[PDB]
Amino acid sequence: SGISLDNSYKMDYPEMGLCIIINNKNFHKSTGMTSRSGTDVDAANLRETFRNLKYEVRNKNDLTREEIVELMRDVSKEDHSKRSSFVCVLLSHGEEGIIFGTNGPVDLKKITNFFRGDRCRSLTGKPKLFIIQACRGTELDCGIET
Amino acid sequence: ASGVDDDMACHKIPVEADFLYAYSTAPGYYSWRNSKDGSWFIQSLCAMLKQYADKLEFMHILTRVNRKVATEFESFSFDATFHAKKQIPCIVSMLTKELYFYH
Amino acid sequence: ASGVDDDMACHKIPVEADFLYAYSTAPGYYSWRNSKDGSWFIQSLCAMLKQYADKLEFMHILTRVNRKVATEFESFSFDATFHAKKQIPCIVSMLTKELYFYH
C-alpha cells in the first residue's frame, strides 16, 4: 500500500466504546456535603452528546465510594478489544486529586489506575478520556477586564 | 547514533500513556455550577462536541471549550466573596496521537 | 435564554487563562535525563519543533513529543529499581485559542 502515517488513534473499531457517567447529586447527610442541583441537566446533556458520537452510554447515580471503585474495577475487567476508546465522566464534589462518593472521597488515581496500560490490556494503546466536573480546591479566580 | 536508552528490542509504552483528563477547572480552584442550567464546563463541552465533533480534533474542541467557559461565564452571588468570579478548564493530555471522533 | 452568569456587560477573562504547561513527565513521576544526550523530553521537544513548527498547531506538536518520548526511550540502570522504566510527558493546557508559531 501507500504511505501510512499513524498520527491519529484508530477510531473505526466496531464500537466507539463505553461512556460511563457517574452522576452524584445527593450525598449522605453524615458527610455534610450539599446536593448538587443542576447535575441532572449535565448528565442528560452528556448522555445525548455521547449517544450522537456512537458511545455506549451507561449512567449511574448517587454512588458510594465503594460502588464507584467496584464499578470502575468491573468496567476495567470487560473485554474492550472491539472498542476504540473509553470515556468516563465524573460529576461530583471534589478536591484536588479526589472525587466524592455519596459517603466519602475516592482518590482519582485509584479510579484511573484500573485503566493503566498494564492493568487493562484491551485498552492498551487506546485513548482513555476522563472528564471531571468537580472542585479542585477552594481558590476563586477574580478575572481581569479585557 | 547509539546509546543506552533508545531503540529497545522489545517495544514498551508507559502505563500512564494514552490518558486525557478534561478537568472543569484549574488546579486548586473551585468549579462552578448553575443550579438550573448545569455546570459551566459540561454545558460548554456538550455544546462544542455537538458543533465540532465531526470537524475538529479533540484537543482543538477542548480549546474551544476553554474559550467558551473563560469568556462567557461569570459568577453571580449575594456573597461578595463568591461574586463576579471566573473559570478556566484545564486539559491534561498524556495522549500520543490525535483523536478524531469520526473516520 | 437568560440567566445570572452569562452575557456580562464588562468582559473579563480568568487570570489563569492562556497558560500552557509542557511538563516532561506525569504527575508524581520522576523525569529522565541522559547524562550525555540531554533529557528525553527536551531532546524530543526540540526535534519536534524543528520538524513541525512551520506545519502543525502546538498541541499537535506536543502530542508528537508525547509519542516520541513514550515509544523511543527506556531507561538503563545498573540498579534494578531504576532499570527499564518509561516516561510520558504531560501537556496541561489553559489556552483559549490554537497556537501556531508561523503566520
Binding site: T34, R36, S37, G38, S92, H93, G94, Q133, A134, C135 | S24, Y30, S31, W32, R33, N34, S35, S39, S75, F76, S77, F82 | V4, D5
Partner: peptide, 4 residues
C-alpha cells in the same frame, strides 16, 4: 451559581 454554586461551587463543587
Amino acid at each position: 451559581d454554586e461551587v463543587d
